[PDB]
Design an enzyme around this catalytic site. Structure first.
Site, PDB file in Angstrom:
ATOM      1  N   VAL A   1      28.369 102.543  32.196  1.00  0.00           N
ATOM      2  CA  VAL A   1      27.091 102.206  32.895  1.00  0.00           C
ATOM      3  C   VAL A   1      27.030 102.852  34.284  1.00  0.00           C
ATOM      4  O   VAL A   1      27.935 102.662  35.111  1.00  0.00           O
ATOM      5  CB  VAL A   1      26.890 100.675  33.022  1.00  0.00           C
ATOM      6  CG1 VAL A   1      25.510 100.352  33.606  1.00  0.00           C
ATOM      7  CG2 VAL A   1      27.070  99.995  31.669  1.00  0.00           C
ATOM      8  N   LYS A  13      23.016 103.392  30.408  1.00  0.00           N
ATOM      9  CA  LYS A  13      24.128 103.265  29.475  1.00  0.00           C
ATOM     10  C   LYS A  13      24.106 104.466  28.535  1.00  0.00           C
ATOM     11  O   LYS A  13      23.038 104.890  28.099  1.00  0.00           O
ATOM     12  CB  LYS A  13      23.985 101.973  28.677  1.00  0.00           C
ATOM     13  CG  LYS A  13      25.220 101.549  27.919  1.00  0.00           C
ATOM     14  CD  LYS A  13      24.877 100.459  26.911  1.00  0.00           C
ATOM     15  CE  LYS A  13      26.102  99.987  26.148  1.00  0.00           C
ATOM     16  NZ  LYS A  13      25.739  98.925  25.178  1.00  0.00           N
ATOM     17  N   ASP A 104      25.264  83.445  24.969  1.00  0.00           N
ATOM     18  CA  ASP A 104      26.107  83.660  26.157  1.00  0.00           C
ATOM     19  C   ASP A 104      25.356  83.465  27.478  1.00  0.00           C
ATOM     20  O   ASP A 104      25.524  84.215  28.430  1.00  0.00           O
ATOM     21  CB  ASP A 104      26.808  85.024  26.088  1.00  0.00           C
ATOM     22  CG  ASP A 104      27.955  85.154  27.078  1.00  0.00           C
ATOM     23  OD1 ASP A 104      28.435  84.131  27.642  1.00  0.00           O
ATOM     24  OD2 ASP A 104      28.377  86.317  27.288  1.00  0.00           O
ATOM     25  N   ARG A 108      26.672  84.720  35.085  1.00  0.00           N
ATOM     26  CA  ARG A 108      27.224  86.080  35.031  1.00  0.00           C
ATOM     27  C   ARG A 108      26.339  87.040  34.267  1.00  0.00           C
ATOM     28  O   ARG A 108      26.382  88.238  34.533  1.00  0.00           O
ATOM     29  CB  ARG A 108      28.633  86.091  34.414  1.00  0.00           C
ATOM     30  CG  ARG A 108      28.748  85.297  33.111  1.00  0.00           C
ATOM     31  CD  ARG A 108      30.093  85.476  32.420  1.00  0.00           C
ATOM     32  NE  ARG A 108      29.965  84.969  31.056  1.00  0.00           N
ATOM     33  CZ  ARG A 108      30.293  83.734  30.670  1.00  0.00           C
ATOM     34  NH1 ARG A 108      30.842  82.883  31.534  1.00  0.00           N
ATOM     35  NH2 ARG A 108      30.091  83.368  29.408  1.00  0.00           N
ATOM     36  N   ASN A 109      25.555  86.508  33.319  1.00  0.00           N
ATOM     37  CA  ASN A 109      24.631  87.295  32.489  1.00  0.00           C
ATOM     38  C   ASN A 109      23.158  87.300  32.964  1.00  0.00           C
ATOM     39  O   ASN A 109      22.269  87.761  32.241  1.00  0.00           O
ATOM     40  CB  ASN A 109      24.704  86.835  31.018  1.00  0.00           C
ATOM     41  CG  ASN A 109      25.969  87.323  30.303  1.00  0.00           C
ATOM     42  OD1 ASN A 109      26.481  88.436  30.561  1.00  0.00           O
ATOM     43  ND2 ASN A 109      26.474  86.499  29.380  1.00  0.00           N
ATOM     44  N   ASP A 122      22.286  90.690  28.858  1.00  0.00           N
ATOM     45  CA  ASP A 122      23.402  90.517  27.962  1.00  0.00           C
ATOM     46  C   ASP A 122      24.256  91.754  28.137  1.00  0.00           C
ATOM     47  O   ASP A 122      23.835  92.867  27.814  1.00  0.00           O
ATOM     48  CB  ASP A 122      22.944  90.366  26.511  1.00  0.00           C
ATOM     49  CG  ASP A 122      24.110  90.358  25.519  1.00  0.00           C
ATOM     50  OD1 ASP A 122      25.285  90.495  25.918  1.00  0.00           O
ATOM     51  OD2 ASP A 122      23.852  90.221  24.316  1.00  0.00           O
TER      52      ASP A 122
HETATM   53  C1  LIG Z   1      23.776  95.631  39.092  1.00  0.00           C
HETATM   54  N1  LIG Z   1      22.374  95.872  38.708  1.00  0.00           N
HETATM   55  C2  LIG Z   1      22.067  96.070  37.429  1.00  0.00           C
HETATM   56  N2  LIG Z   1      20.787  96.189  37.054  1.00  0.00           N
HETATM   57  C3  LIG Z   1      20.446  96.367  35.793  1.00  0.00           C
HETATM   58  C4  LIG Z   1      21.441  96.442  34.826  1.00  0.00           C
HETATM   59  C5  LIG Z   1      22.781  96.309  35.215  1.00  0.00           C
HETATM   60  C6  LIG Z   1      23.851  96.402  34.307  1.00  0.00           C
HETATM   61  C7  LIG Z   1      25.163  96.284  34.775  1.00  0.00           C
HETATM   62  C8  LIG Z   1      26.236  96.399  33.890  1.00  0.00           C
HETATM   63  C9  LIG Z   1      25.972  96.649  32.543  1.00  0.00           C
HETATM   64  N3  LIG Z   1      24.709  96.766  32.122  1.00  0.00           N
HETATM   65  C10 LIG Z   1      23.656  96.655  32.952  1.00  0.00           C
HETATM   66  O1  LIG Z   1      22.387  96.783  32.493  1.00  0.00           O
HETATM   67  C11 LIG Z   1      22.114  96.787  31.153  1.00  0.00           C
HETATM   68  C12 LIG Z   1      21.738  95.594  30.543  1.00  0.00           C
HETATM   69  C13 LIG Z   1      21.463  95.553  29.175  1.00  0.00           C
HETATM   70  C14 LIG Z   1      21.027  94.214  28.549  1.00  0.00           C
HETATM   71  O2  LIG Z   1      20.985  93.198  29.242  1.00  0.00           O
HETATM   72  N4  LIG Z   1      20.655  94.275  27.262  1.00  0.00           N
HETATM   73  C15 LIG Z   1      20.163  93.284  26.492  1.00  0.00           C
HETATM   74  C16 LIG Z   1      19.419  92.243  27.051  1.00  0.00           C
HETATM   75  C17 LIG Z   1      18.858  91.271  26.236  1.00  0.00           C
HETATM   76  C18 LIG Z   1      18.085  90.096  26.842  1.00  0.00           C
HETATM   77  F1  LIG Z   1      18.865  89.044  26.750  1.00  0.00           F
HETATM   78  F2  LIG Z   1      17.783  90.257  28.127  1.00  0.00           F
HETATM   79  F3  LIG Z   1      16.996  89.845  26.153  1.00  0.00           F
HETATM   80  C19 LIG Z   1      19.041  91.326  24.859  1.00  0.00           C
HETATM   81  C20 LIG Z   1      19.758  92.360  24.283  1.00  0.00           C
HETATM   82  C21 LIG Z   1      20.315  93.355  25.101  1.00  0.00           C
HETATM   83  N5  LIG Z   1      21.030  94.370  24.587  1.00  0.00           N
HETATM   84  C22 LIG Z   1      22.413  93.933  24.303  1.00  0.00           C
HETATM   85  C23 LIG Z   1      23.266  95.192  24.117  1.00  0.00           C
HETATM   86  O3  LIG Z   1      22.767  95.985  23.015  1.00  0.00           O
HETATM   87  C24 LIG Z   1      21.306  96.215  23.067  1.00  0.00           C
HETATM   88  C25 LIG Z   1      20.460  94.967  23.366  1.00  0.00           C
HETATM   89  C26 LIG Z   1      21.510  96.740  28.438  1.00  0.00           C
HETATM   90  C27 LIG Z   1      21.874  97.937  29.055  1.00  0.00           C
HETATM   91  C28 LIG Z   1      22.169  97.966  30.413  1.00  0.00           C
HETATM   92  C29 LIG Z   1      22.572  99.297  31.084  1.00  0.00           C
HETATM   93  N6  LIG Z   1      23.047  96.129  36.520  1.00  0.00           N
END
Ligand SMILES: CNc1nccc(-c2cccnc2Oc2cc(C(=O)Nc3cc(C(F)(F)F)ccc3N3CCOCC3)ccc2C)n1
Length: 252
Positions: A1, A13, A104, A108-109, A122
């Site tokens: 990420v 990602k 979950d 943290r989420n 997530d």
């Molecule tokens: C620190 N600031 C920050 N802003 C935005 C995102 C992030 C972050 C940090 C570390 C890891 N990931 C992220 O951001 C995400 C977050 C997600 C994510 O939350 N994905 C999903 C969310 C949901 C939700 F519950 F919100 F409905 C449901 C399913 C999600 N994904 C789960 C993973 O596979 C695809 C579907 C996917 C990709 C990325 C790059 N950090």
């Protein structure tokens, strides 16, 4: 990420595109900006995850001189805290009407976006018995610990614990209690105790999320109503001011 520009700020990602697209859009969930390769783009949250943000507000620990002088325990107010709670509920209501089961829910989420608007995320890595990785036991409904059941009601129990994470400013749930004794004590009706800075009415709402009977627990629509009632009252519901015997809910 990875952090990136192009909305400007994004967290990138590098099979998941079907799930993200089907979530649609909501101010209280993460925002799927776009994709491609040679890479999933989601709107960056400048304040990062709620847990760390709740803990960084423990100003007595970070900046004791500033804290004592202001008689403050937190840089967040009861209004901000409860708005985080209402933010998660609103997003979980949206997410549950689409029959999405998180499994979950914990601080943290949850992400803290623009205007301190909390967003469900997530940070697991892929998306009827349901898939589970390592069990987040302190956030788990009785019926998940026994029986391995996962529904919107078990999400509601986990929300109860998140609500407790909000009020306690990132406290570790059941501090001083082993994971093993939770399996043993919860069936017997043991629940987490009311934090000291907590008003009885926020505690009641947590207790509603933890009813033994999954079908007796409130819906996320009902949880948002309760919280909105609290935010509309003049009454302060979460104490953030220092007092002689003040102590933070324990972290480690
Ligand atoms: C620190 N600031 C920050 N802003 C935005 C995102 C992030 C972050 C940090 C570390 C890891 N990931 C992220 O951001 C995400 C977050 C997600 C994510 O939350 N994905 C999903 C969310 C949901 C939700 F519950 F919100 F409905 C449901 C399913 C999600 N994904 C789960 C993973 O596979 C695809 C579907 C996917 C990709 C990325 C790059 N950090």
């Amino acid at each position: 990420v990875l952090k990136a520009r192009i909305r400007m700020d994004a967290a990138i990602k590098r099979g998941e595109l079907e799930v993200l697209c089907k979530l649609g859009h909501h101010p209280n969930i993460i925002n799927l900006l776009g994709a491609c390769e040679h890479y999933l783009a989601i709107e960056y949250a400048p304040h990062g995850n709620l847990l760390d943000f709740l803990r960084k507000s423990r100003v007595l620990e970070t900046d004791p001189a500033f804290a004592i002088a202001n008689s403050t325990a937190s840089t967040l107010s009861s209004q901000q805290l409860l708005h985080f709670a209402a933010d998660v509920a609103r997003g979980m209501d949206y997410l549950s009407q689409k029959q999405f089961i998180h499994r979950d829910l914990a601080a943290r989420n949850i992400l803290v976006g623009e205007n301190y608007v909390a967003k469900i995320a997530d940070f697991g890595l892929s998306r009827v018995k349901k898939t589970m990785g390592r069990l987040p036991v302190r956030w788990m409904a009785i019926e998940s610990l026994n029986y391995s059941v996962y529904t919107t009601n078990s999400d509601v129990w986990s929300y109860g614990v998140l609500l407790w994470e909000i009020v306690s400013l990132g406290g570790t749930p059941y501090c001083g209690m082993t994971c093993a004794e939770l399996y043993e004590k919860l069936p017997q009706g043991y629940r987490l105790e009311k934090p000291l800075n907590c008003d009885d009415e926020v505690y009641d709402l947590m207790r509603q999320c933890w009813r033994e009977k999954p079908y007796e627990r409130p819906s996320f629509a009902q949880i948002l109503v309760s919280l909105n009632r609290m935010l509309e009252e003049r009454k302060t519901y979460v104490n953030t001011t220092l007092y002689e015997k003040f102590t933070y809910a324990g972290i480690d």
